[PDB]
Design a binder for this molecule. Structure first.
Ligand SMILES: CCCCCCCCCCCCCCCCCC(=O)OC[C@H](COP(=O)([O-])OCC(O)COP(=O)([O-])OC[C@@H](COC(=O)CCCCCCCCCCCCCCCCC)OC(=O)CCCCCCCCCCCCCCCCC)OC(=O)CCCCCCCCCCCCCCCCC
Ligand SMILES: CCCCCCCCCCCCCCCCCC(=O)OC[C@H](COP(=O)([O-])OCC[N+](C)(C)C)OC(=O)CCCCCCCCCCCCCCCCC
Ligand SMILES: CCCCCCCCCCCCCCCCCC(=O)OC[C@H](COP(=O)([O-])OCC[N+](C)(C)C)OC(=O)CCCCCCCCCCCCCCCCC
Ligand SMILES: CCCCCCCCCCCCCCCCCCCC(=O)O[C@H](COC(=O)CCCCCCCCCCCCCC)COP(=O)(O)OCCN
Ligand SMILES: CCCCCCCCCCCCCCCCCCCC(=O)O[C@H](COC(=O)CCCCCCCCCCCCCC)COP(=O)(O)OCCN
Ligand code: HEC
Ligand code: HEM
Ligand code: HEM
Ligand SMILES: CCCCCCCCCCCCO[C@@H]1O[C@H](CO)[C@@H](O[C@H]2O[C@H](CO)[C@@H](O)[C@H](O)[C@H]2O)[C@H](O)[C@H]1O
Ligand SMILES: CCCCCCCCCCCCO[C@@H]1O[C@H](CO)[C@@H](O[C@H]2O[C@H](CO)[C@@H](O)[C@H](O)[C@H]2O)[C@H](O)[C@H]1O
Lengths: 124, 244, 54, 383, 63, 71, 85
């Protein structure tokens, strides 16, 4: 699935009062049991990067964000190979789990999908 | 399927060879050969066993040569191309009671007694099945069982009706080592002998396995030390990050 | 420890020679030790134990 | 420049076994690849050796296997090693495929190694099936008969194809001799495809248990994974030792110690354990051709995992719901295995159908739905 | 935390006698033992395995 | 004589008495049913194989080790 | 998506200092007892439900099916077997 589709569907749910009332609490529990925060990851660190679109989005990250992401990946890799969890300041707090990459990939995909549409335009 | 259609499952008997470190009891193998020779060999072949196979397992070279030399085997034709017989040699296979299947079935009311060389591997249960079958003929079939003609009731046999009658009775064999030849004793001995016949490498295999287990275990332990030794710089790695 | 290291370990040629010689010794002694152990745990059962009767 | 890099031949070995850059966090489930290579080497060594003593003619085949067991020095070992390693090969391959499915190894950019892998799995099945026939015991013959008669379901030409495969009107000498030749060949074909899937993998490198890039933090294949592979090699050899030396017939069928007899039908004709799940799937469909299609589809459906997994994240480490679903899928696959060897009797008939439906619904319904929902939960949950 | 000249704490892992010959010799004893068992195991494996090609029991019986 | 005879008898009267009794009760019933006329033209003819199996399985569990100890 | 040593395809790295010590300088089994007990317990506890739930469900299903099958092929199960076929 494209990030675009995920974001759009999520926004439909957040709009609906009833839907959000059921989904938001479930999503928050899911994220707690997912346990990526216990390796010091942000959610966006987990997104598959081996696509043209995502490589382009990563290149557009501000240098600081980019350097910090590299460190989080290396740190998580070290926790993984040691079979340890993050402790203290290494644990990602909910307020630190920011969607730093989502705006970049949404722009990359917006252009890519517009290009696909316009490649199929028919002069009326 | 009904339990009857499967056959009763044999008990697990404590065979001397049960046990990772245990050989066959060779005195039991020798006695079991004698049961084979005096009882089973009337109807059953042991075609995969040669006289040489007994040597240094159950018999000396001389005893086995004596068994072979008592028999006649087909020789190569003479100079006029006429058939000839010769005395047996250690290389010869133990001869069966029948020339072909048809003769075997004619002597056994249509049933074919199987070759016993692999029978311990060819039946679920192995030695336990052989022992249970030979000792498991009740005097009377359970009320309601209808046996087909020439069939005998034996609960261990699938379906219950076997073409082989009970053959082991107290004192049908006189053992040469003075052991009392009860039904149970003879069944145990012959089951051991047939287990050996199916897997003659058994004793050597388990001893080599002991050696392998020891070497491989030690190598496993050492490989753990060496892996941990080599990996410790990676496991012990520490980082200090100063965001640029 | 220094002496031992210098003679048998430092040069890989020497280390490999020592390992191979030790493997030879191990192989021969292990064989003998297992043979004896196997014969003791399976005492009275093997052909070699009953052979004398025949 | 170092010779290992300069010389083109040495550099190819170097690129795969020494300088190959690996993730630093591969867990023990990444050790099954080298165990599969070990099984393949054992099967080649033992198989070529058995071929020096085996006779493929139906009048002599079963007896040549007894000759190996009884007369050939260490023939018992070589035979038992070959027979037991065939089972270990399937244990390792299921573990390897299980790892691949759990960790999303099938996702872009590794669709090609996964797809070649699916073919390797099919080749292994064919290899092992033909090797089993070579004994020419009761299970050999009757297994060959039943399995080759599935080809009769091909419309119009099926019967003709079966007679063509057999080289006659039933399984006999011509069948045995051709299975020998093809059983010898197929492991070489399998080695080639194994090499191809590794070359395909080398463009992206190994995935890792976190599902993230490892480009940030690489470790040389040697010495790290060389010495880590030795641990599982010795664990494997311990398991091998316990079967080959202490219980060599535990995984086999006693009926294969009875010479093939076209007259007498064995009480139950079952495949070797590692084929049992596919046999259960076949039984679930009442139609003959339906059953064959379902059985083949059960393997070919692996090819659609790259499409039906809609996750924006690679692998299951961080996906609680996908981990539960995976657990149910695996246990269902084991239940199918068990149901492959029960008698066709109530209530196992209906149970086999339910388990078959569940098997296919994992790919077609559950994984696409669960992966879609988890995407939304990650996004909303972290807002 | 900030200074890169302050080495992180390695005291839980560091051996005091890290520079001694006894220290190195111990690890080479482990490596050497592993090489020794691998040599003995390879020799046993090769010998037992290749003996399949020597005259089988049925061939020796006819000699 | 055969040691099994005594061991089997002892196990039947002792630890496997319930099963012995089921077998017995079954036999009585079946023999009586065979005695009655138009038994040959019955749909279902009961046997006692099941009860026999339960008894023998029980005897074997209580005897196997004891028997091999005296051989 | 993967290069080679020197150009692996990492985003630019800066600001990370990495430290480690020689394998000869380290105790390879440091903290092994703590890890073997406490780490394994933590690791196992967190994954237990994902194994227990499917295993216990499918084992229960098998147990019920195998017990029914066994009962259907007894004398007592004659009538129920006749209907089932
Ligand atoms: C066949 C040939 C023989 C060769 C042997 C090869 C097998 C090696 C292998 O891949 O498995 C070892 C493997 C150890 O591998 P590892 O690299 O230490 O950990 C991999 C995961 O990180 C392990 O995941 P984790 O870190 O989350 O630890 C959880 C796991 C393992 O717990 C541990 O602490 C280990 O605990 C369990 O066993 C699951 C709970 C079940 C309770 C009942 O054991 C498991 O992971 C078993 C769990 C599978 C379910
Ligand atoms: C039986 C059911 C197994 C379900 C596994 C669920 C996850 C779990 O607990 O495993 C432990 C581990 C969990 O590992 P992990 O990598 O998810 O987590 C590591 C720890 N954290 C989360 C902190 C990073 O899972 C594995 O290692 C799974 C490998 C799957 C292999 C399956 C083989 C089956 C063969 C059938 C083929 C068809
Ligand atoms: C399979 C057969 C295994 C053969 C191993 C026989 C002895 C070789 C050995 O142990 O290697 C140690 C040696 C040396 O191990 P090392 O590389 O750890 O030691 C080098 C440092 N010194 C010399 C100071 C000890 O490895 C080799 O020479 C490679 C051959 C192994 C294959
Ligand atoms: C092919 C299958 C490979 C698996 C091998 C496992 C055991 C097979 C060895 C044969 C055997 O029975 O050896 C036993 C000892 O095992 C051992 O000590 C062998 C275990 C060693 C494990 C693997 C080490 C290397 C083996 C593979 C390398 C082969 C080629 C490399 C040059 C006892 O036999 P014995 O001691 O009586 O033997 C005479 C020499 N005294
Ligand atoms: C099987 C038997 C085990 C392997 C035999 C080798 C003996 C091991 C002792 C030798 C040793 O430790 O020295 C290293 C040799 O290892 C090596 O060079 C090899 C390392 C480990 C070999 C195994 C590789 C993977 C095994 C899995 C099988 C693969 C599937 C194919 C069947 C040198 O190496 P160093 O760099 O540590 O030097 C350090 C400084 N000189
Ligand atoms: C005079 C005939 C006869 C004697 C004596 C005899 N058998 Fe048999 N045996 C048979 C026949 C006939 C069958 C085939 C029964 C059938 O398939 O219904 C048979 C079958 C067997 C089977 C296989 C049962 C199965 O599962 O297929 C074994 C094992 C066996 N015999 C062992 C022995 C042993 C051990 C002895 C004596 C120590 C023995 N037999 C003595 C005639 C004999
Ligand atoms: C992927 C590799 C292989 C697998 C999975 C495999 C599998 C099998 C299996 C399951 C059997 C039946 C074993 C038994 O129960 O006795 C067998 C037999 C046989 N295989 Fe293979 N095999 C492989 C490679 C080879 C190779 C390369 C040869 C070379 C000829 C070979 C030659 C034989 C022979 C001659 C037999 C019959 C003798 C016997 O049963 O042991 N195999 N194989
Ligand atoms: C003869 C059989 C096989 C051998 C020798 C083999 C060997 C290997 C090896 C050595 C690796 C790299 C190390 C590892 O991850 O374990 C690997 C990776 C892989 N194999 Fe296999 N393999 C075999 C069969 C299969 C099959 C049947 C599949 C798929 C259905 C498969 C799919 C893969 C995939 C996708 C990877 C990449 C996994 C990753 O690192 O993320 N292979 N294989
Ligand atoms: C697994 C057993 C070991 C034998 C090796 C397997 C045989 C397969 C090798 C033939 C396939 C060609 O393999 C290809 O080789 C070249 C160089 O060798 C590798 O090239 C890689 O390494 C070299 C240096 O090591 C770099 O110049 C290059 O940037 C990098 O991509 C490819 O990544 C690999 O895909
Ligand atoms: C490059 C490698 C060099 C060439 C390799 C040499 C190949 C052949 C070497 C000898 C093989 C036969 O050598 C012979 O091996 C067998 C075991 O295998 C040994 O036999 C020994 O063990 C076996 C079981 O392990 C017993 O059944 C036997 O009673 C005992 O003597 C012989 O004592 C030895 O003489």
């Amino acid at each position: 699935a494209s990030i675009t589709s995920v974001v759009k569907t999520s926004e439909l749910i957040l709009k609906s009062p009833l839907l959000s009332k059921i989904v938001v609490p479930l999503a928050k529990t899911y994220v707690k049991f997912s346990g990526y925060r216990q390796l010091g990851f942000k959610m966006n660190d987990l997104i598959i990067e081996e696509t043209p679109n995502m490589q382009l989005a990563l290149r557009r990250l501000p240098p600081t964000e980019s350097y910090d992401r590299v460190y989080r990946l290396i740190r998580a890799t070290q926790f993984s190979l040691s079979h340890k969890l993050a402790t203290g300041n290494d644990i990602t707090k909910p307020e630190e789990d920011d969607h730093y990459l989502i705006p970049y990939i949404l722009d990359v995909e917006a252009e890519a999908f517009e290009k696909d549409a316009l490649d199929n335009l028919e002069v009326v | 399927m009904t339990a009857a259609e499967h056959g009763l499952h044999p008990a697990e008997y404590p065979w001397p060879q049960n046990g990772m470190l245990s050989t066959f009891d060779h005195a039991s193998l020798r006695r079991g050969y004698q049961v084979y020779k005096e009882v089973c060999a009337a109807c059953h072949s042991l075609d995969r066993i040669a006289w040489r196979n007994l040597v240094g397992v159950t018999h000396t070279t001389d005893e086995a040569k004596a068994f072979a030399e008592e028999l006649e085997y087909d020789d190569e034709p003479d100079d006029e191309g006429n058939p000839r017989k010769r005395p047996g040699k250690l290389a010869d296979y133990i001869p069966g009671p029948y020339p072909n299947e048809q003769a075997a079935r004619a002597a056994n009311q249509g049933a074919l007694p199987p070759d016993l060389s692999l029978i311990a591997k060819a039946r679920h249960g192995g030695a336990d099945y052989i022992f249970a079958l030979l000792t498991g003929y009740p005097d009377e079939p359970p009320a309601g069982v209808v046996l087909a003609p020439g069939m005998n009731y034996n609960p261990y046999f699938p379906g219950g009706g076997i073409g082989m009658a009970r053959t082991l009775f107290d004192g049908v064999v006189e053992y040469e080592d003075g052991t009392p030849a009860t039904t149970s004793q003879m069944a145990k001995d012959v089951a051991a002998f047939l287990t050996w016949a199916a897997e003659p490498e058994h004793d050597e295999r388990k001893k080599l396995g002991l050696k392998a287990i020891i070497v491989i275990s030690a190598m496993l332990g050492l490989s753990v030390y060496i892996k941990k030794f080599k990996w410790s710089p990676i496991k012990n790695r520490k980082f200090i990050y100063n965001p640029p | 420890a220094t002496t031992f290291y210098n003679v048998f370990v430092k040069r890989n040629s020497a280390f490999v020679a020592t390992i191979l010689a030790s493997a030879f010794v191990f192989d021969m002694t292990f064989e003998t030790a297992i043979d004896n152990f196997w014969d003791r745990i399976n005492a009275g059962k093997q052909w070699k134990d009953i052979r004398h009767k025949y | 420049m170092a010779l290992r890099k300069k010389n083109s031949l040495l550099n190819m070995a170097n690129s795969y076994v020494l300088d190959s850059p690996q993730p630093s966090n591969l867990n023990y489930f990444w050790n099954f690849g080298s165990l599969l290579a070990l099984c393949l080497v054992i099967q080649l060594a033992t198989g070529i050796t058995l071929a020096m003593h085996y006779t493929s003619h139906a009048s002599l085949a079963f007896d040549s296997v007894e000759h190996i067991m009884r007369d050939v020095n260490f023939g018992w070992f070589i035979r038992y090693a070959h027979a037991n390693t065939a089972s270990f090969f399937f244990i390792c391959i299921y573990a390897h495929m299980g790892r691949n499915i759990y960790y999303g190894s099938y996702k872009t950019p590794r669709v090609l190694p996964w797809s070649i892998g699916v073919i390797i799995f099919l080749l292994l099945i064919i290899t092992a099936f033909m090797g089993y026939v070579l004994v020419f015991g009761q299970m050999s013959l009757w297994g060959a008969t039943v399995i080759c008669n599935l080809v009769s379901a091909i419309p119009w030409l099926g019967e003709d194809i079966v007679h063509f495969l057999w080289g006659g009107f039933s399984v006999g000498n011509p069948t045995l001799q051709r299975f020998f030749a093809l059983h010898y060949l197929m492991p070489f074909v399998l080695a080639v495809f194994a090499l191809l899937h590794l070359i395909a993998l080398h463009t992206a490198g190994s995935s890792n248990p976190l599902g993230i890039t490892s480009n940030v933090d690489k470790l040389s294949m040697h010495p790290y994974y060389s010495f880590k592979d030795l641990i599982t090699v010795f664990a494997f050899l311990l398991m091998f030792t316990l079967f080959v030396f202490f219980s060599p017939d535990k995984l086999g069928h006693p009926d294969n110690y009875i010479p093939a007899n076209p007259m007498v039908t064995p009480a139950s004709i079952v495949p070797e354990w590692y084929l049992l799940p596919f046999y259960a799937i076949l039984r679930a469909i009442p139609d003959k051709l339906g059953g064959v299609i379902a059985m083949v589809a059960a393997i070919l459906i692996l090819l659609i995992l790259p499409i039906v997994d809609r996750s924006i994240i690679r692998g299951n480490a961080f996906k609680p719901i996908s981990k539960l679903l995976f657990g149910f899928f695996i246990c269902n696959f084991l239940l199918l295995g068990v149901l492959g060897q029960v008698h066709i009797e109530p209530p196992f008939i209906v149970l086999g159908q339910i388990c078959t439906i569940f098997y296919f619904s994992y790919f077609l319904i559950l994984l696409p739905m669960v992966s879609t929902i988890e995407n939304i939960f990650f996004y909303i949950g972290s807002l | 935390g900030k200074s890169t000249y302050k080495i992180p704490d390695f005291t839980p892992y560091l051996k005091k006698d890290r520079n001694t010959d006894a220290n190195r010799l111990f690890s080479y004893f482990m490596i050497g033992s592993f090489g020794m068992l691998s040599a003995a195991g390879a020799k046993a494996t090769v010998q037992d395995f290749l003996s399949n090609m020597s005259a089988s029991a049925d061939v020796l019986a006819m000699a | 004589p055969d040691p099994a005879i005594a061991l089997h008898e002892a196990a039947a009267e002792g630890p496997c008495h319930d099963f012995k009794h089921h077998f017995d009760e079954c036999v009585e019933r079946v023999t009586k049913a065979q005695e009655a006329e138009d038994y040959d033209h019955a749909e279902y003819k009961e046997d006692c194989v099941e009860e026999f199996f339960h008894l023998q399985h029980c005897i074997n569990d209580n005897t196997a080790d004891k028997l091999f100890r005296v051989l | 998506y993967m290069g080679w040593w020197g150009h692996m395809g990492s985003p630019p790295q800066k600001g990370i200092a990495g430290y480690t010590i020689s394998p000869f300088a380290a105790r390879p089994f440091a903290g092994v007892v703590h890890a073997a007990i406490f780490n394994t317990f933590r690791r196992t506890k967190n994954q237990a439900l994902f194994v227990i739930l499917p295993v216990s469900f499918f084992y229960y299903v098998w147990t019920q099916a195998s017990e029914k099958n066994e009962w259907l092929y007894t004398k007592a199960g004659r009538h129920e077997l006749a209907k089932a076929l």
